[PDB]
Ligand binder design. Structure first.
Ligand SMILES: Nc1ncnc2c1ncn2[C@@H]1O[C@H](COP(=O)(O)OP(=O)(O)O)[C@@H](O)[C@H]1O
Ligand SMILES: Nc1ncnc2c1ncn2[C@@H]1O[C@H](COP(=O)(O)OP(=O)(O)O)[C@@H](O)[C@H]1O
Ligand SMILES: Nc1ncnc2c1ncn2[C@@H]1O[C@H](COP(=O)(O)OP(=O)(O)O)[C@@H](O)[C@H]1O
Ligand SMILES: Nc1ncnc2c1ncn2[C@@H]1O[C@H](COP(=O)(O)OP(=O)(O)O)[C@@H](O)[C@H]1O
Ligand SMILES: Nc1ncnc2c1ncn2[C@@H]1O[C@H](COP(=O)(O)OP(=O)(O)O)[C@@H](O)[C@H]1O
Ligand SMILES: Nc1ncnc2c1ncn2[C@@H]1O[C@H](COP(=O)(O)OP(=O)(O)O)[C@@H](O)[C@H]1O
Lengths: 302, 277, 260, 287, 305, 300
C-alpha cells in the first residue's frame, strides 16, 4: 500500500528541521498522487505544487530528500522534452511508468517576464502527450521552487503596509504566510501559470533554534562533517554548547541560510586547520571565546 | 446531418453552467458551418478570463463532433489531426481546429488559414473550422478607454487596437466574450457538472472509508473566497486544497469515518469535525 | 491590355461611391501594361475607412496579376513561382525612406505599388495650405509633405486619390447592389433552409444609419447585421418557423421578428 | 585605353541637363581611376568623390548615367558587407572588377560613419581599389557655412553661390566624422535646377517626360502635342510647388488624365495642350 | 598522502610575494579537496573559494602557480556555460574518473554583476548538478575558485562599514583595512545575486601592494622584473647594474601609477629605451643605472670595451 | 638573426617623415620581440599603445612597419581578431602564434570589448572556428586617437594648485600621458595596465608637410607628377608653391588627408585639358595655388 503521510513525515523529519507545513503538504500530495494511480491506473485531476522558500531553507533538500524515498519515477530538472527524456530513460523506456511520475521544477521563481517557457509550461503543467515516443503530462505531478526574490515586497504592497501618510524575519514569516496569486502574477509570472499550481506553501525562514538545531540534529549536520575531517588528522574537534549559539546568530546575520553556517565555521576553523597537519596536536577545543574571536582555539598537545 | 444548436446547447449545458449567452452564439455558428458544409467563414475566437471554460467548451464540442478535431494553442497541427484522426481527406478538410491563446510572422501566416488555402497532399483547408481562443489580457482596458469619456462638470476595433492585425481581426469572422463567473455559477460548478470539484473530493475521501459532508452553507462561504482570486475554476481547487489538507493528514489509517464542514470551519473558527469508531 | 472602358465596367460593380477613384485606377493600369506590352511606372497612393483592401482585391480579381498585401517573396508565391515583376503590391497603413530603393528596383523596378493611408489632419493641412464637405476639401488636395510625409517618399507617390470617403448613403447600395452584398448573403444563408427572410426597405435605411452613427465603415456591416439575425438563426431551426420578417423598429431593438 | 574625359563628359551630357561642373569633375575622376589601374595593375592612392545634392538634382540618375557608359559595376544603399556582397553579385564576382569597381552610398548625412571609415580606406572584408562615390543632402551646411561667413562677436543663387565655397571645416561642423571626411577628398556641389533647366528637361534628355508621354499616346492611334508656352507654364508651376525633377512627372500626369481614358477604342487622333489648359481652366480639345 | 599545507605554502611562496592569508586559504583548500576525494571515493561537501583583490595584484598568478601544483585536472576560464566542463573534460584527457575530481578556476566573475542571467546559469555547477559535456557529467565535487577584480567593491564596503552612514552617528591604509571587513551583504550590494553569494562561502581579500613589497617583487621572487631585463641585456652580451636606492626609487614611482605589478614594467620600460636601442652593436660592456638616472637627472651610463 | 633596431629606424625613416621617437619605440619593440620568441622557446611581453591625433602616421606606421615583419600581422577593428591573424600565416600554427596584431580604434571602445580582450592580451587559449590557439605570444600594437585627452590631462595639470586650499600645447602636453589619464578617458585600469608602453605621436608641422609632399616614398606631388607622365606631359611645381599648399592644409586641420584634397582641386583643369590636347608641361606657381592665376600651359 502507499505509505501514509506520517511515514513520509517521519522520513522528511530525518533530514529537514521542521518545515512542518511544507513537510505535510509534500506528504499529502505524494500520497494523493500514489492513491490516484491505484484508481486511475470520473477523472482524478492532479494539483500542481508550489514552494516559495527563500535561499538556504532546503527546497532542493526537500526534493532530494523525498527523491530517495520515491517508489515512483521522478525527475529533477532546473529552469523541454529532455526533462521527460530523463524520466523516460530513468524508466528505461517504460512509457507507462513515466506517465505517472513526479517532476521537480527547481528555480521556477527565476523565470519571469524566457516567458515562452512559461507559455510552454502551461500545456505541460496541464496534460499533453509529447514525443521523444509519446507520453502524456496529464498525471505528471509538478513541484515548483524558488526564492521569488521580490515577492515579499509585492505582498507588503498588496497588504498596503507600505502606505504612507494619512488615510482611512518574523515580519517576513507573516508576509510569506499570506501569499496571494495576485503577487505571484506580479513577480513576472503569467497568470495562467499562477492559475495552475493550485497548492502553494511558504517555507518559513529559519530561526535561532533552527540553526542551533541544524548544527547537530540532521544527518550530515555541519559540525559532524567538520569533526570527521579533523578525525582523519587524528584530532577530535569539540565545541562547547554555548559557542553554537553565537555561531547561529552570526550566520543568521549573514542572511544566507543554512549554507552560511559553513562560511562562519570555515573562518573559525581556519587557524586550526593550517596548524594541525603534523603538529602532534591530539584534540582541538573551540569555546565561546573562540566564536567571539577573543581567544585563539585551545590546543591539546601530546 | 447537424443537430440544431438548441440540441447542441443540450450537450454543452451538461458541462459549462453560466455561459449560455456565449454558448448560444457558438452553437448557432457550428450549425451555420455545418449548414455551410453543403449548399462567410464560421471561424471563431474565444475571449475573456482563464478558468472560465475556454478550453472545456472546445473539448466538449468535439465530444459531440463526429468529424475529427484538433486543438492547439499559439503547420503540423493539422498533421496531428490528419495522422491520428483523419482517414478521409474531405473529412480532414471537414475537421475542426481550435487555436487557443491566439491573443498571446505567424499572424501573417494565419491569414493563409484565416482565409484558408493549401496552407502527401497540401489540402485546401478552407473547409476547416478555425475556432480560436486566448486571454486577450487587457482588451477590457482598451475598451474602457474607448467606451467612456471623462465627462465633467455639474449637470473588432478593440481587437485591432489590442495588437492584432486588421486583416487578422477581419479573417476569423466570429467572436465571443465569455462571462466572468459569479457565485451563482460557482455554487453550481462545485457540484452540478460531471467531474466537478466537490464530487472528486468526496471520492478522494470515499476511498479512505470516510463520508465527507459539506453543507450548503459551506459552499456559500467558499464561493465568496474562491472568486477573490481570479483563478475561477482553479480557485475552487486552491481553497478546497487549503481547507481539506488537515483532515487528509489525519484521515488515513486513523479510524476516522466522517468529517463535517460549516461556515465557521471555513472561516477558521473551528477545527474540522471528525467522527470516529 | 483591355481598354479602361472594360476595366471600369468590372470595377464599377463593386464600389459604387468612388466613381472618380475608379477612373484613376482603371486608366493608369491599362497604360502601364501597354508600355509593358512594348517606360517608367508611377506608384499609386490611395488616400480608407471605405474599402481600400476591398478595392485592392477588386483589381486583383480583375487582372490576376501577382497580388500581395503588406502592412507599413510572398508575391512570387502569390505568382505561384511562375510578368515576373509586373504585379501589384498593396502597402497598407502607409499613413519611410527604406522602401525607396524597394519602390525602385531592389529587381523591383517594374512593381506597381498601391499605397494606402488615412492622413489624419490632411484636411487641416489642406486647411493650412488653403489658409461630404471634408471630402470636398480633400478633393482640393508639397501639401502632402506639410502634413508630415517624407519628401523623398512623396516623390515616388506621384498619383494620389480621394476615396469618396463619406460613403454615407452608398452603404444602402452596398447592403444591396454589389456582387455579394451582405443582406443578399443572409438571404442565401437563412433561405438556404426553408425559411423566409424579408428585410424591409426602411430597416436598411435605419441599418445604414446605425453603422454611420457608430462611426463604422463597411467593415462593420457584417458584424452588426449578424447581431440582428443571431436570434432568428437561433429560433428558426428544428422545423419551428419558416415565415420570418425583420422591420425597421426591430433594428431599433424594440421588437422580435415575425413568425408563424 | 580609357576614353578621354571630354568624350565621357559629352557622353554624360546626353542624359543629364546643364550641370557641367559636377559632370566635368566626375569625368576626371573616372578617367584618373582607369589610368591608375592601368598604372598600378610609386603606387598612387584612390580619391573618393562626394556629391552634395539638393534632393532631385539627379544625383542618383547621374551615377546611373556614368554607370551606363563606364560599364563599371555599381551599387547603392543606406552590417557592413551588405553593400560589398551586392557589388560581388553585380560584378559577376569578377575578382578584379570587384576590386576595380565603383560604389555609390546614398544620403550619407556616428557608428555607421566610423564603421565605414576603414571600409572607405582599402581594407579587406578587398576595398583597396574600390572607387567610392557618395551622395548626401547635408541641408543646413550652407547655414553652417553662413555661420562661418566671417561672423564676429567682439568689438536663391546665393545659396549655390555659398555652397560653391564649401570646405571641410563646415562639414566637420556639420557632424561628419573627420576621419570619414578625410576619406572623402573630392567635394562636388550639384547645381540647383532653374525653370530653364526644367524646360530643357522636357525637351533635351534622351528619355524626357514629354517624349515618354508623347510615346504612350503615340502607342494608341493618337498623338500628343504641346505648345512652348504650355511647357513654360508647366515649369513655372513645378518650381512653385518646391518639388524637384521628381515632381515634374506628377504634374504632367495630372494634365493627361482625361485624354488617356478618352482616346482608346480609336476615338481621337491628336490632343493639344495650351497655356490655358496648363492652368486647368479648360479641358484639352481632342481631335 | 596528500601534500601538507606546509609544503604548498612554501611551494607557492617562491612565486607569490606576501599575502599569507591568501596563501593560507588556498593551501588549506587544495589539501581539503584531497580529503574529499579520498572520502567520497558521513558525506563531506565543498566550500567554494572567492578571491577578490585590487587590479591584477597576484590573483591570476596565484591560481596558475597553484595550478602547477595540482595532481587533479584544472581549468581556468573567463566569465557558453558548457565551456567550463568542455575545457575541463578536454583538459583531463577525457578521463572522467579523474576529471570529476577536478578544480576549476573562474576569472572575472566580478564582471558578471547585474549580465545577471549568467549568474543563475552557473548556480547548477556551483553546488551540484550533472553537466551536458557528448556526455553528461556531475559538477558536485568540483572545487571552484572565483577570481574577480571587483573594481569599486571598496566603494560598497565603505558605504557598508559606516564609512558612509546616515544621521548623527552618536587611502592605502583605509582600503586594505576596509576590505578586511567585507561582509556577504557587500557582495549582494555589489550586484551579485544573493543566491550566488551564498554558494561562495569563502571570501578572500588580497591586500594592496605595499612599497616594500614592490621592492621585493623587483628582485626576490622567480621571474622578477630586473632579472628579466638583465637577461634581455645579457642576450646583447651586456650587463645591467641597478643600485638598491634605484630599486627604492622605481617602487616609489610605481606606487604612484596606481596600477600594481604592471607599473613596474612601464617605469622599467621607459628608462631602458635608449640603452636597448643603442647597445646591440655598439660594443657596450655594461649599463649603469643610478638613482639620479631613474629620476631623469642623468642619461644611462655606458662603459665601452 | 634579428635585424638591429637602428636599421628599422633608418628603414622607417624612408616611409615616414617625422616621429623618430615613435619609430624608435617600435624599433625596440620588434627587436625585443625577436629575442623573446627565441628565449621562450622566462620573459613576458609589453604591448604598445599609439596615440595619434587625427590624420597622422598611426595607420601608415602599422602598414610600413608590417612590411618588415617575417612574422604575420593583422590590422583589425572578438575571436575574429585571432581568426584574421591565423589566416595570414597560411594556417601554420607554430608561426601564427608568434604574430604582431594591431587592434585599431581602441579609443572607439564599449566596456564589453575592453574587458573581453583581457584574456587575449594576458594570454589565453582561444580557438578559431576549430584550431586551438594560445594568445600569450601575440604582440598587440593598439592605435587610438584619445580625442580630448589633452584637455583631460590639461585639467589635471591646470587644477593642480588651482583651489584655494593650495596645437603647441597639444604636442608638448601629450608627451606626458599617464595611467590616470588613460583611465580617466574611460579605459578600464585593467586595460590600461596591460598596455604598459604608451607612445604619443606629435602633430604635423608645416616643415614636415613640405617634406611629405616631396621626400618620402609615394609622396603626393611625385604621384601627381607620375600621373601626368602617364599622359606624356610633365607637371612642374615650383618650390615656392609647395609652401602655400602646406599653409592651406593647416587651416584645413585635416593633416595628411588634407594635402591631396587641396592638391587634387588644383590639378582638375590640367587633368581635364591636358589629355590628348597636346601640352608639354604645366607650371604651378604660387599664383596658381593662391587662386589668382590659371595654370600656364606649355605647347609645341
Ligand atoms: N532547515 C534545514 N535543515 C537542514 N539543512 C538545511 C535547512 N535549510 C537549508 N539546509 C541546507 O541547505 C543546503 C542547500 O539546499 P537548499 O537550501 O535547498 O538550496 P536552494 O534553497 O537554493 O534550492 C543543503 O545543504 C541543506 O543541508
Ligand atoms: N464554468 C465552469 N464550469 C465547469 N468547469 C469550468 C468552468 N470554467 C472553467 N472550468 C474548468 O477549467 C478547466 C480549464 O479549462 P479552461 O478554464 O476552459 O481553460 P483556460 O484555463 O485556458 O481558460 C477545465 O477543467 C474546466 O473544467
Ligand atoms: N464596396 C465594397 N464592396 C464589398 N466590400 C467592401 C466594400 N467596401 C468595403 N468593403 C469591406 O470593408 C472592409 C474594408 O474596411 P476598410 O476600413 O476600408 O479597411 P481597408 O482599408 O483595409 O479596406 C473589407 O472587409 C471589405 O471587404
Ligand atoms: N538632368 C536630368 N536629366 C534627366 N533626368 C533628371 C535630371 N535631373 C533629375 N532627373 C530625374 O529626377 C530624379 C532626380 O532626383 P534624384 O537623383 O532621385 O535625387 P535624390 O537621389 O537626391 O533623391 C530622377 O528620377 C531623374 O531621372
Ligand atoms: N605579488 C606579486 N608577485 C609577483 N608578481 C605579481 C604579484 N602581483 C601581481 N603580479 C603580476 O601580475 C600578474 C598576475 O596577476 P594578473 O594576471 O594581473 O591578474 P588578473 O587576472 O586580474 O589580470 C602577473 O603579471 C604577475 O607578474
Ligand atoms: N607623416 C606622414 N607621412 C606620410 N603620410 C602620412 C603621414 N601622416 C599621415 N599620412 C597619411 O595619412 C594616413 C595616415 O593617417 P591615419 O592613421 O589615417 O590618421 P588617423 O590617426 O586619424 O587614423 C595614410 O593614408 C598616410 O598616407
Amino acid at each position: 500500500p502507499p505509505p501514509p503521510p506520517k511515514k513520509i513525515y517521519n522520513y522528511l523529519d530525518k533530514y529537514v528541521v521542521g518545515q512542518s507545513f511544507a513537510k505535510k503538504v509534500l506528504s499529502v500530495a505524494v500520497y494523493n498522487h500514489y492513491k490516484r494511480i491505484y484508481n486511475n491506473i470520473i477523472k482524478l485531476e492532479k494539483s500542481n505544487i508550489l514552494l516559495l522558500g527563500p535561499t538556504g531553507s532546503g527546497k532542493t533538500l526537500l526534493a532530494q530528500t523525498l527523491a530517495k524515498c520515491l517508489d515512483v519515477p521522478f525527475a529533477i530538472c532546473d529552469c523541454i522534452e529532455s526533462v521527460i527524456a530523463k524520466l523516460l530513460q530513468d524508466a528505461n523506456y517504460n512509457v507507462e511508468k513515466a506517465q505517472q511520475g513526479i517532476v521537480f521544477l527547481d528555480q521556477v521563481d527565476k523565470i519571469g517576464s524566457g516567458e515562452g517557457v512559461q507559455q510552454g509550461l502551461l500545456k505541460l503543467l496541464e496534460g499533453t502527450i509529447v514525443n521523444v515516443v509519446q507520453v502524456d503530462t496529464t498525471n505528471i505531478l509538478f513541484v515548483a521552487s524558488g526564492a521569488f526574490n521580490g515577492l515579499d515586497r509585492i505582498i507588503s504592497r498588496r497588504k498596503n503596509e507600505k502606505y504612507l501618510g494619512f488615510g482611512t524575519i518574523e515580519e517576513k514569516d507573516r508576509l510569506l504566510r499570506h501569499v496571494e496569486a495576485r503577487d505571484l502574477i506580479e513577480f513576472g509570472m503569467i497568470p495562467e501559470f499562477v492559475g495552475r499550481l493550485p497548492v502553494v506553501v511558504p517555507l518559513h525562514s529559519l530561526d535561532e533554534k533552527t540553526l542551533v538545531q541544524i548544527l547537530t540534529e540532521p544527518r550530515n549536520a555541519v559540525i559532524p562533517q567538520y569533526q570527521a575531517l579533523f578525525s582523519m588528522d587524528k584530532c577530535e574537534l569539540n565545541v562547547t554548547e554555548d559557542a553554537l549559539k553565537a555561531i547561529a546568530r552570526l550566520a543568521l546575520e549573514r542572511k544566507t541560510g543554512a549554507r552560511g553556517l559553513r562560511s562562519i565555521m570555515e573562518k573559525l576553523l581556519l587557524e586550526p586547520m593550517f596548524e594541525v597537519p603534523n603538529s602532534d596536536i591530539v584534540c582541538v577545543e573551540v569555546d565561546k571565546e573562540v566564536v567571539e574571536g577573543k581567544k585563539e582555539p585551545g590546543y591539546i598537545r601530546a
